[PDB]
Amino acid sequence: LQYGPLAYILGEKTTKKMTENSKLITVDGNICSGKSKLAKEVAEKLGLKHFPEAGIHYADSTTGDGKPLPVRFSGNCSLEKFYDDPKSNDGNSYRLQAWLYASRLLQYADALEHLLSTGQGVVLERSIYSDFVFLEAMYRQGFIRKQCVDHYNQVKKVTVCEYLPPHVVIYVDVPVSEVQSRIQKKGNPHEMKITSAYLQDIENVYKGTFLPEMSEKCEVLQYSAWEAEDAEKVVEDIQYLKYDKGPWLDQDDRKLHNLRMLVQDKLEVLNYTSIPVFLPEVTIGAHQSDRVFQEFTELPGRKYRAGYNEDVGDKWIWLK
Amino acid sequence: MMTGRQARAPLQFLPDEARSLPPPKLTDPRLAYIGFLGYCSGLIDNAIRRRPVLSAGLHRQFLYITSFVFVGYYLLKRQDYMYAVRDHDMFSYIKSHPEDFPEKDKKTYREVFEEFHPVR
Amino acid sequence: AKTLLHQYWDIPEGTECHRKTYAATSIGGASGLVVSAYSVALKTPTSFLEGVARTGRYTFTAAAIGAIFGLTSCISAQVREKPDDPLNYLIGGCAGGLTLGARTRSYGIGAAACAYMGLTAALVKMGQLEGWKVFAEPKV
Amino acid sequence: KFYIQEPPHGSPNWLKVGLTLGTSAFLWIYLIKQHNEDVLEYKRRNGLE
Amino acid sequence: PFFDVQKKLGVDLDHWMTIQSAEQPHRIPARCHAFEKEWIECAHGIGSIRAEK
Amino acid sequence: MSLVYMNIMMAFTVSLTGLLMYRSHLMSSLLCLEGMMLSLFILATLMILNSHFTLASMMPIILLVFAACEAALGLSLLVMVSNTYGTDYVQNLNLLQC
Amino acid sequence: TLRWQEDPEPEDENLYEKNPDSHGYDKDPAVDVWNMRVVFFFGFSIVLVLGSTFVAYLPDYRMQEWARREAERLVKYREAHGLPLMESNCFDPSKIQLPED
Amino acid sequence: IRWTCARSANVYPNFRPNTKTSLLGALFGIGPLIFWYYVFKTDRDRKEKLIQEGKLDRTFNISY
Amino acid sequence: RDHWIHVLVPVGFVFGYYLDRKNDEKLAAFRNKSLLYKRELKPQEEVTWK
Amino acid sequence: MLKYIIPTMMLMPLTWLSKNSMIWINTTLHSLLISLTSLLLLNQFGDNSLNFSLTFFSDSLSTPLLILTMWLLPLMLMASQHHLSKENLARKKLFISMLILLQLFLIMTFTATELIFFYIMFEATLVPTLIIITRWGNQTERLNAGLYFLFYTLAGSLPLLVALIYIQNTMGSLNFLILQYWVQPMPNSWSNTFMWLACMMAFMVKMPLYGLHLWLPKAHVEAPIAGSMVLAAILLKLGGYGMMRITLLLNPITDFMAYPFIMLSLWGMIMTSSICLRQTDLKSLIAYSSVSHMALVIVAILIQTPWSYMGATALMIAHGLTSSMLFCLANSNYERVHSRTMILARGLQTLLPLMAAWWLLASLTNLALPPSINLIGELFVVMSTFSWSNITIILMGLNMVITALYSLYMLITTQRGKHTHHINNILPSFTRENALMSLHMLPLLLLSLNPKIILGPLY
Amino acid sequence: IARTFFDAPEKNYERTMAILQIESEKAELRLKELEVRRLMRAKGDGPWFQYPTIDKALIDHSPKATPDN
Amino acid sequence: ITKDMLPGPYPKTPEERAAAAKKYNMRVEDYEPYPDDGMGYGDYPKLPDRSQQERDPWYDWDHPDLRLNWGEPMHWDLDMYIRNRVDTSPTPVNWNLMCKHLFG
Amino acid sequence: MNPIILIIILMTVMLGTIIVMISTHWLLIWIGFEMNMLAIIPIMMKKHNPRATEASTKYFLTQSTASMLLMMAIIINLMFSGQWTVMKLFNPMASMLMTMALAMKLGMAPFHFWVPEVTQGIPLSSGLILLTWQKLAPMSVLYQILPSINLDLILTLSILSITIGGWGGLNQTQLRKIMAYSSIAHMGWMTAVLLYNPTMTLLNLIIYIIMTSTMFTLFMANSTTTTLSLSHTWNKAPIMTILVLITLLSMGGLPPLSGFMPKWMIIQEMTKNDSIILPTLMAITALLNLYFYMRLTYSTALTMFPSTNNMKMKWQFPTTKRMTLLPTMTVLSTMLLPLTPILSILE
Amino acid sequence: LLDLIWLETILPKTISLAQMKMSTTITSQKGLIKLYFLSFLITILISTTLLNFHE
Amino acid sequence: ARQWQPDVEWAEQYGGAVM
């Protein structure tokens, strides 16, 4: 552990490195709002680190060699199977939603750690505060059951209270008709199987339950499809904001020290993701879990710790 | 029980009289057992942190064994000292009070009578 | 609580059944009073009269236990013509167990109470005969 | 290289290894010196030499 | 356990206030100085059982 | 022993029985605890001044101060309770039954 | 009704399919043959036969036959001096002090 | 499987202690024990009484 | 060595066997002192048994 | 005794540093070497026992049990390597380590001259046995079986610890030789009555006694095959050995205080035997047969005559061997048909002739066919109980019927008749199973030639 | 077999005699320890069970303000 | 095998009796459980108490030796009424006549 | 909380306990007890939850009543003896008051009601600090006053504590309440032998401290607070399940583990005084402690409860918690039986 | 009747039911400090007046 | 066939508010 109470005692305060550009900016929108590149555009104006949107294999890219592991080890779910079969009997929809929520939580922890450790601002896409807008969009379409929503609400309630909201949230307004036009334009074959009612429900829960929810905890900026093409106007708007709302103002060095100690422990971050609630969508039996774990240990560079793997060519093991 | 014995020289781990006793040998079975305990603790330390158990951290295992052997040697020396103190106090109290410990007339079996209970 | 056991034990076995029955009834009533006090302290009754009713029920149950045990033990020790025998206290303990079953309005509790209370009373008489000590003075 | 992120335990902490081996050697030499002193003191006190 | 740190280290922390016949400011005597002094000089070093009997 | 010893011991006893039977509030129990401390103060200083124990006269002030410090701590806890349920009732401190 | 994720029970394996010469010890044929050889050598030809030879040639177990030889001495003494073949007392009655009554 | 589970693992949850079951258990559980105890106690008491009075034939009895 | 492990059990016997012999050296307080086997020592025999 | 403890404890580096394919070969080889080494305990003298040091000794009673234990370990290693073939390597090594620890605890339990050391390792034998039963048992009821076994044993045996500490405080020593020369008679009092009960009830539970046997038809069924071997072949005999050791100090109260318990076995070995006539389960049948045989052992110990003691020793050894062989045969059938019920697989002599021959020989040795040592032990107990009382022969003779009445019954429904049509996975017998049967049986028939080495310390 | 593997009966005999002597001495020592502990608990005149009393070095023997003390 | 296939407690209401008769593969009016005297029988049916020798020796059974069919609810004492054990087959003369003649 | 302030508060707790241990004046014992209470109050309020506030309030009220009864006993002994030296008391009423005060401080039944309450509402580290460190000073005070301790009262408290602890731990699902009831039973064991041989009380205190430290360290390392997460631990790390199985085996007094060492020694000091019924009864009652330990080992290591899909993510991250002295405390608490006579260093 | 019912009833299961019932009665507390302190007062009064622990 | 391991209802009856 390179950071802890001892480094804080000797003088490594996080308020010494936080500048005026050290802001957490989250760019939102629909599934084809064109928000993606826009975030990258922000990332090439204020010198902020750009984290891409967390998929199934984000944690596989974070750890190990960075390669995506096979799907039986990470996720055990498919996005294409969800698009083709939104009402599957194996519970792929809620399993994918829970895995995506865990990946978004890990990405938010990594972003907070980078911001509190280096003082450089971070641009994210679709943080944990904007993941339930998919979940209800599943449940309002009859894709999942009510107990899945109860389990998701329990997990979110017990794990979202320990973090801080972003400084700026950016929303891109694109209608569902132009969204389906873009979907036909790209040509990913499983993506035309999505329905217009799903996108309409996504937009409805974006506008009625999300923007009023964090109107007060952060500064909200909404753009349409042609205001988003100009990044200079966007960075001019975010550079002229007076941050006087939310809980980011009353942050002492002790509170940020506690937050940095929290986000650097990845097992503590994911402690409450696997709560012992037995739902058929997420519960994995004993024999299957044993077999999959035994397969996972046999992967190269995975049996031991990150510096004690001889099969990948680590030396001086007997002195470590 | 021995609270009044170590009441005039308090907080002494090993007093001067403990130097009159033979020290434990370095090849003692108890010292070897304590060293084995230290080696087992080193192996557990390797195991719970996902390391090669018999391979990683030879210096840490050696430090475990050495520290365990050191502490065990001092504890064994104190243990034999306190048992010697117990025996010395017992023999002194027996010698000082001869009337409370009378020698018994040790009869042979030609004079004593034991009841016979047949098994049949 | 030491004078009650003393006044119970100073009566010789199988001599006067009335005094032994009264002493055992007093001991049982004291035990029931303690149990009822702890019950009304730990579990509050919904009314004052409910608390008095529960206290009276517990006290009467334990007093009946003591009276039946003492009466049966003294009568059996009188009619069997041996005072120093744990079988008399075993019979008294089973009579007390049957009284417990009659109080709780069930049969299985009565049978189990007969067995275990007879064993316990026989053990108590055996300890009184052989001088067994549960709160032994430290002598070593 | 193999790992995308460098492990904290990729390279041995040579200062900690030095302190570990040094304190182990110091404890061993103190133990054998104390044993020799104890046996010499015992032989002096009890008269067998 | 009663770790006699004071007697091992030779320091005095609360022995001046333990008894009543101890040293007092301006040598003010208590009303039972002689009785407690006699009891203390009896029971010194003979143990609690012999002291009480 | 003297009469005032009986009276002070009876005062301590009735304050102890007042503490052990909570009625509605917690401030009342805190006041009962400080009444117990006051009776201890009075008993100790009466015994000390009767027998002309000179040095021991330094003692009851400490017996005040430490216990008085404890009282301050108790008040803070009550305020924290008053910050949660809005009142100092003892029948709200039952979240740990399960 | 939807149920949890679980692997189905695997089919029962037959060791005679992939190895018709299997001894039933292991799937690996060389390991199979070596395990059979180890069991048959150290069980039958090392413990059983040599153990039977050891027990058959135990050096006068529990002194048993020795007592027979001693009997062939004692009777030979006690039939030669006219003594009784066996006395009814184990110890000498002279050296036993009975309690008075 | 139904027959085996009924014969072995279903006997206890469907048992209720009543007068019939208790009387059958007491009659067939501690009846023969008391009977054989009394028989063997009587025989061995008679045998010990005969042996200690020098009445029973125990001439060649040296293996017991 | 490819199969050094096969010396683990036999030599652990032998050393263990040796340990038992050492125990005999700690139990020789009555050697040639028992009333049944008290016998004068033969020439060039320092002990009756080891 | 250090020459057997040290190699047994060095078996753990042997089984923990071996390759993933040669753990079974190495462990079986070295345990067979230890079994060969075990024959040096036969140096027994007609007057004095074999005393090694202040801590360990071995007379002629512990020696057959030690030889049986160190012979039994390789048999468990060969038996338990088929239902663990697909198991993870670390769990395989943990299972082998549990077996090794159980053997080490047993062979230093049988040799402890001091009684509290005997108690300590007599209860240290609980942990590996319970771990094996509750970990590698198959069905749901292994947890309840483990709870029943552990709690019966401990609730019976804590007063044994209290009584042993009382003996150490009263007599001044717990060494068995000192107690052999310092034993005082126990008079008639209630304190001595409960002293006898506290000393006896632990071994009563572990024998098992009828009425305290409820943990046997669970723990002998839910356990795996090696667990069945140790459960039926050592631990019951360990309770019998402890009973033989501790009945020395309880004279002459035993002469009446054994009066109820004998009846509790004399009738008991009838009833449990009758249970084997109406058992739908093969493993339960073997367990109740074990109950009956050990009840006969209980009667033999309680009447305390020399002939009964030698009969008890021979009976314990022979019953251990026969019960282990029967459990092996039942486990082979369970592996082939994947169900434990006896009526499912019938007519197996038409398909498996040599295993039918092993079944016939095991059943013949079960019903005490002369001149096997089963018949020798049963006969000697019969002579001693006839000397005890006359009508006891009736309680013997009826048993002599009912035993055969289940044994041949166990021979018929599993081997004779028309085979089951729909069961078509009856593979031919492996060499491993036949080798296991021969290694179980040939020592028994060889022991019929020279039985004087298992006839107890007063032979 | 007797020459190679088996111990002599004389060696076992004398080893058993030594063992019996050692445990007999240990048992007598244990009984004497129990008797000594009981006696020192009862009377308290020996080095054990010496519960502390007040040290007499804390007394002030200087003349006080009042002569009557 | 599933948990609803094992025998359960004694049925009292008619729908539980119907479900029990459906479980044991028999008609509802042919299913008579043992009396509820607390002897552990549960809902297992009371069969007409006849030995296996009384069955048809020529009809092809699933188990020809046992004279039994796959899925048939077997008797509580089937291990007692096999052809190797006690038989209940009718006799040419009466039982009391046999007992009287033999005793006389 | 600042690290400097937390360190200062922890050294204040240590200083208060040391002040109780090393002082020869009753007023300093009282001062150290108030120091300990006042300095340990904020550790229970580390998270600022309503449950923590209620737990701290209950702990404060119980400790305040105990300290006031202790001061009453000190004042009565002052009146009837005229001195303050920490030794035997010179009034039976003061001895009774002090004994029930220290019983309330230790959590002995029937003053045990706060122990399963309070330990549930505070974090794991603070619960460990409570259940191990807070029991050192009252045990020292009980050690110093054993010539004046009534035997009937202390044995009644011991048997009540053991029985109530077993019957309370028989019911819980939460780990912290289980450890609280186990603590109550263990202090019944430690106080049952105090008047016969206090060296066994010291030995049982040390063994209990090591075992509770090992179990709480394992729970902190696995971040488990209920039995179901402890069941889930088999997928994340099996070695932790093996360690908790061995430690729970040792905590029940199962030989040859080190937990058989104290209680057996306790029996060896109570059959010397011809008390046979009480140790047998206490062992029979401790079988219930063994029962719920067995239930925990059944749930954790002897079987495999089902896990969830997100647990796969936890396979990709090594643990980074400072598991201080976990292997040493695991070894010392389980294989310490063959060094049993080392207890003679505590005589 | 004997092995599967009555011997299973008298020794292990009646004891198990007794400990289960005692465990349920012990831990039926509502978490109220007032009742706990009333129990403390009852315990002190019993130990002083009835059991006579202060003499 | 394979070894039985606890299912959902076993873990549910082991994971309530009270045993």
Side-chain angles (χ1 to χ4, degrees), chain A residues 45-62:
Chain A
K45 298 303 182 189
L46 306 99
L48 314 181
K49 191 165 183 326
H50 173 252
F51 286 89
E53 196 185 12
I56 287 144
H57 303 285
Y58 168 70
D60 316 65
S61 74
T62 311

PDB file of all heavy atoms in Angstrom, chain A residues 45-62:
ATOM      1  N   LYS A  45     -10.109  19.612 -24.934  1.00  0.00           N
ATOM      2  CA  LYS A  45     -10.137  21.057 -24.746  1.00  0.00           C
ATOM      3  C   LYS A  45      -9.603  21.497 -23.396  1.00  0.00           C
ATOM      4  O   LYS A  45      -8.896  22.503 -23.318  1.00  0.00           O
ATOM      5  CB  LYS A  45     -11.561  21.595 -24.923  1.00  0.00           C
ATOM      6  CG  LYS A  45     -12.147  21.384 -26.309  1.00  0.00           C
ATOM      7  CD  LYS A  45     -11.288  22.010 -27.392  1.00  0.00           C
ATOM      8  CE  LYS A  45     -11.926  21.832 -28.761  1.00  0.00           C
ATOM      9  NZ  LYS A  45     -11.011  22.235 -29.862  1.00  0.00           N
ATOM     10  N   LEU A  46      -9.924  20.773 -22.325  1.00  0.00           N
ATOM     11  CA  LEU A  46      -9.494  21.126 -20.979  1.00  0.00           C
ATOM     12  C   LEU A  46      -8.430  20.182 -20.436  1.00  0.00           C
ATOM     13  O   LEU A  46      -8.066  20.289 -19.261  1.00  0.00           O
ATOM     14  CB  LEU A  46     -10.693  21.158 -20.029  1.00  0.00           C
ATOM     15  CG  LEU A  46     -11.875  22.041 -20.426  1.00  0.00           C
ATOM     16  CD1 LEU A  46     -12.973  21.221 -21.061  1.00  0.00           C
ATOM     17  CD2 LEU A  46     -12.405  22.780 -19.212  1.00  0.00           C
ATOM     18  N   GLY A  47      -7.917  19.274 -21.260  1.00  0.00           N
ATOM     19  CA  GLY A  47      -6.896  18.343 -20.814  1.00  0.00           C
ATOM     20  C   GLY A  47      -7.370  17.355 -19.771  1.00  0.00           C
ATOM     21  O   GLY A  47      -6.657  17.102 -18.793  1.00  0.00           O
ATOM     22  N   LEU A  48      -8.561  16.797 -19.951  1.00  0.00           N
ATOM     23  CA  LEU A  48      -9.143  15.872 -18.991  1.00  0.00           C
ATOM     24  C   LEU A  48      -9.026  14.446 -19.508  1.00  0.00           C
ATOM     25  O   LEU A  48      -9.101  14.204 -20.715  1.00  0.00           O
ATOM     26  CB  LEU A  48     -10.610  16.216 -18.726  1.00  0.00           C
ATOM     27  CG  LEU A  48     -10.917  17.693 -18.479  1.00  0.00           C
ATOM     28  CD1 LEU A  48     -12.389  17.888 -18.211  1.00  0.00           C
ATOM     29  CD2 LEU A  48     -10.093  18.241 -17.326  1.00  0.00           C
ATOM     30  N   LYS A  49      -8.824  13.508 -18.586  1.00  0.00           N
ATOM     31  CA  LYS A  49      -8.753  12.101 -18.949  1.00  0.00           C
ATOM     32  C   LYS A  49     -10.123  11.609 -19.394  1.00  0.00           C
ATOM     33  O   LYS A  49     -11.136  11.898 -18.752  1.00  0.00           O
ATOM     34  CB  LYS A  49      -8.249  11.275 -17.768  1.00  0.00           C
ATOM     35  CG  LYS A  49      -7.888   9.845 -18.122  1.00  0.00           C
ATOM     36  CD  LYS A  49      -7.069   9.193 -17.023  1.00  0.00           C
ATOM     37  CE  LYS A  49      -6.648   7.787 -17.411  1.00  0.00           C
ATOM     38  NZ  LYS A  49      -7.681   7.108 -18.238  1.00  0.00           N
ATOM     39  N   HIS A  50     -10.155  10.865 -20.494  1.00  0.00           N
ATOM     40  CA  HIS A  50     -11.396  10.366 -21.070  1.00  0.00           C
ATOM     41  C   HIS A  50     -11.506   8.874 -20.796  1.00  0.00           C
ATOM     42  O   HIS A  50     -10.760   8.074 -21.368  1.00  0.00           O
ATOM     43  CB  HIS A  50     -11.460  10.643 -22.568  1.00  0.00           C
ATOM     44  CG  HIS A  50     -12.639  10.020 -23.245  1.00  0.00           C
ATOM     45  ND1 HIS A  50     -12.527   8.940 -24.093  1.00  0.00           N
ATOM     46  CD2 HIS A  50     -13.959  10.318 -23.189  1.00  0.00           C
ATOM     47  CE1 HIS A  50     -13.725   8.605 -24.536  1.00  0.00           C
ATOM     48  NE2 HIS A  50     -14.612   9.424 -24.002  1.00  0.00           N
ATOM     49  N   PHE A  51     -12.435   8.504 -19.921  1.00  0.00           N
ATOM     50  CA  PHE A  51     -12.762   7.105 -19.710  1.00  0.00           C
ATOM     51  C   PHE A  51     -13.896   6.711 -20.644  1.00  0.00           C
ATOM     52  O   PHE A  51     -14.970   7.326 -20.584  1.00  0.00           O
ATOM     53  CB  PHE A  51     -13.172   6.857 -18.271  1.00  0.00           C
ATOM     54  CG  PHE A  51     -12.031   6.881 -17.300  1.00  0.00           C
ATOM     55  CD1 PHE A  51     -11.632   8.066 -16.711  1.00  0.00           C
ATOM     56  CD2 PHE A  51     -11.363   5.717 -16.967  1.00  0.00           C
ATOM     57  CE1 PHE A  51     -10.586   8.093 -15.811  1.00  0.00           C
ATOM     58  CE2 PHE A  51     -10.314   5.736 -16.067  1.00  0.00           C
ATOM     59  CZ  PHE A  51      -9.925   6.927 -15.490  1.00  0.00           C
ATOM     60  N   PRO A  52     -13.710   5.723 -21.516  1.00  0.00           N
ATOM     61  CA  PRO A  52     -14.816   5.258 -22.361  1.00  0.00           C
ATOM     62  C   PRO A  52     -15.895   4.589 -21.525  1.00  0.00           C
ATOM     63  O   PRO A  52     -15.694   4.245 -20.359  1.00  0.00           O
ATOM     64  CB  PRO A  52     -14.149   4.262 -23.315  1.00  0.00           C
ATOM     65  CG  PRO A  52     -12.683   4.540 -23.214  1.00  0.00           C
ATOM     66  CD  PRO A  52     -12.453   5.025 -21.823  1.00  0.00           C
ATOM     67  N   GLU A  53     -17.065   4.426 -22.140  1.00  0.00           N
ATOM     68  CA  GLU A  53     -18.212   3.868 -21.436  1.00  0.00           C
ATOM     69  C   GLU A  53     -17.947   2.421 -21.041  1.00  0.00           C
ATOM     70  O   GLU A  53     -17.469   1.621 -21.851  1.00  0.00           O
ATOM     71  CB  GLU A  53     -19.465   3.957 -22.302  1.00  0.00           C
ATOM     72  CG  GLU A  53     -20.749   3.766 -21.518  1.00  0.00           C
ATOM     73  CD  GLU A  53     -21.971   3.729 -22.403  1.00  0.00           C
ATOM     74  OE1 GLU A  53     -21.812   3.629 -23.638  1.00  0.00           O
ATOM     75  OE2 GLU A  53     -23.094   3.801 -21.864  1.00  0.00           O
ATOM     76  N   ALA A  54     -18.256   2.094 -19.789  1.00  0.00           N
ATOM     77  CA  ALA A  54     -17.915   0.790 -19.238  1.00  0.00           C
ATOM     78  C   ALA A  54     -18.813  -0.285 -19.832  1.00  0.00           C
ATOM     79  O   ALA A  54     -20.040  -0.225 -19.703  1.00  0.00           O
ATOM     80  CB  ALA A  54     -18.038   0.812 -17.717  1.00  0.00           C
ATOM     81  N   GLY A  55     -18.202  -1.260 -20.486  1.00  0.00           N
ATOM     82  CA  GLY A  55     -18.895  -2.396 -21.040  1.00  0.00           C
ATOM     83  C   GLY A  55     -18.795  -3.611 -20.146  1.00  0.00           C
ATOM     84  O   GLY A  55     -18.609  -3.504 -18.928  1.00  0.00           O
ATOM     85  N   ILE A  56     -18.930  -4.787 -20.757  1.00  0.00           N
ATOM     86  CA  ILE A  56     -18.792  -6.033 -20.013  1.00  0.00           C
ATOM     87  C   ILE A  56     -17.342  -6.248 -19.599  1.00  0.00           C
ATOM     88  O   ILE A  56     -17.058  -6.650 -18.464  1.00  0.00           O
ATOM     89  CB  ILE A  56     -19.339  -7.201 -20.854  1.00  0.00           C
ATOM     90  CG1 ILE A  56     -20.867  -7.142 -20.898  1.00  0.00           C
ATOM     91  CG2 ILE A  56     -18.878  -8.543 -20.314  1.00  0.00           C
ATOM     92  CD1 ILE A  56     -21.456  -7.574 -22.217  1.00  0.00           C
ATOM     93  N   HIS A  57     -16.401  -5.940 -20.487  1.00  0.00           N
ATOM     94  CA  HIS A  57     -14.989  -6.254 -20.280  1.00  0.00           C
ATOM     95  C   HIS A  57     -14.176  -5.044 -19.843  1.00  0.00           C
ATOM     96  O   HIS A  57     -13.018  -4.897 -20.242  1.00  0.00           O
ATOM     97  CB  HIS A  57     -14.400  -6.863 -21.547  1.00  0.00           C
ATOM     98  CG  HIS A  57     -15.114  -8.094 -22.010  1.00  0.00           C
ATOM     99  ND1 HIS A  57     -14.979  -9.312 -21.381  1.00  0.00           N
ATOM    100  CD2 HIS A  57     -15.974  -8.292 -23.034  1.00  0.00           C
ATOM    101  CE1 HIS A  57     -15.723 -10.209 -22.001  1.00  0.00           C
ATOM    102  NE2 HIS A  57     -16.338  -9.616 -23.008  1.00  0.00           N
ATOM    103  N   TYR A  58     -14.750  -4.155 -19.031  1.00  0.00           N
ATOM    104  CA  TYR A  58     -13.971  -3.039 -18.504  1.00  0.00           C
ATOM    105  C   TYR A  58     -13.000  -3.503 -17.424  1.00  0.00           C
ATOM    106  O   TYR A  58     -11.828  -3.104 -17.414  1.00  0.00           O
ATOM    107  CB  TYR A  58     -14.896  -1.956 -17.951  1.00  0.00           C
ATOM    108  CG  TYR A  58     -14.155  -0.924 -17.139  1.00  0.00           C
ATOM    109  CD1 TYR A  58     -13.293  -0.022 -17.748  1.00  0.00           C
ATOM    110  CD2 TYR A  58     -14.300  -0.862 -15.760  1.00  0.00           C
ATOM    111  CE1 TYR A  58     -12.605   0.918 -17.008  1.00  0.00           C
ATOM    112  CE2 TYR A  58     -13.615   0.072 -15.013  1.00  0.00           C
ATOM    113  CZ  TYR A  58     -12.771   0.960 -15.642  1.00  0.00           C
ATOM    114  OH  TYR A  58     -12.089   1.894 -14.899  1.00  0.00           O
ATOM    115  N   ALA A  59     -13.478  -4.340 -16.498  1.00  0.00           N
ATOM    116  CA  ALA A  59     -12.625  -4.824 -15.419  1.00  0.00           C
ATOM    117  C   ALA A  59     -11.527  -5.735 -15.942  1.00  0.00           C
ATOM    118  O   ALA A  59     -10.442  -5.797 -15.355  1.00  0.00           O
ATOM    119  CB  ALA A  59     -13.463  -5.554 -14.372  1.00  0.00           C
ATOM    120  N   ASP A  60     -11.792  -6.450 -17.035  1.00  0.00           N
ATOM    121  CA  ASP A  60     -10.757  -7.251 -17.672  1.00  0.00           C
ATOM    122  C   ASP A  60      -9.690  -6.376 -18.310  1.00  0.00           C
ATOM    123  O   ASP A  60      -8.525  -6.777 -18.384  1.00  0.00           O
ATOM    124  CB  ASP A  60     -11.391  -8.168 -18.710  1.00  0.00           C
ATOM    125  CG  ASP A  60     -12.656  -8.817 -18.202  1.00  0.00           C
ATOM    126  OD1 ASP A  60     -13.638  -8.094 -17.943  1.00  0.00           O
ATOM    127  OD2 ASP A  60     -12.671 -10.051 -18.053  1.00  0.00           O
ATOM    128  N   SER A  61     -10.068  -5.190 -18.787  1.00  0.00           N
ATOM    129  CA  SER A  61      -9.090  -4.250 -19.316  1.00  0.00           C
ATOM    130  C   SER A  61      -8.313  -3.559 -18.206  1.00  0.00           C
ATOM    131  O   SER A  61      -7.158  -3.172 -18.412  1.00  0.00           O
ATOM    132  CB  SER A  61      -9.783  -3.208 -20.192  1.00  0.00           C
ATOM    133  OG  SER A  61     -10.492  -2.274 -19.398  1.00  0.00           O
ATOM    134  N   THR A  62      -8.930  -3.383 -17.036  1.00  0.00           N
ATOM    135  CA  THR A  62      -8.240  -2.737 -15.923  1.00  0.00           C
ATOM    136  C   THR A  62      -7.134  -3.623 -15.361  1.00  0.00           C
ATOM    137  O   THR A  62      -6.015  -3.157 -15.120  1.00  0.00           O
ATOM    138  CB  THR A  62      -9.241  -2.373 -14.825  1.00  0.00           C
ATOM    139  OG1 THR A  62     -10.355  -1.681 -15.400  1.00  0.00           O
ATOM    140  CG2 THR A  62      -8.586  -1.488 -13.777  1.00  0.00           C
TER     141      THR A  62
END
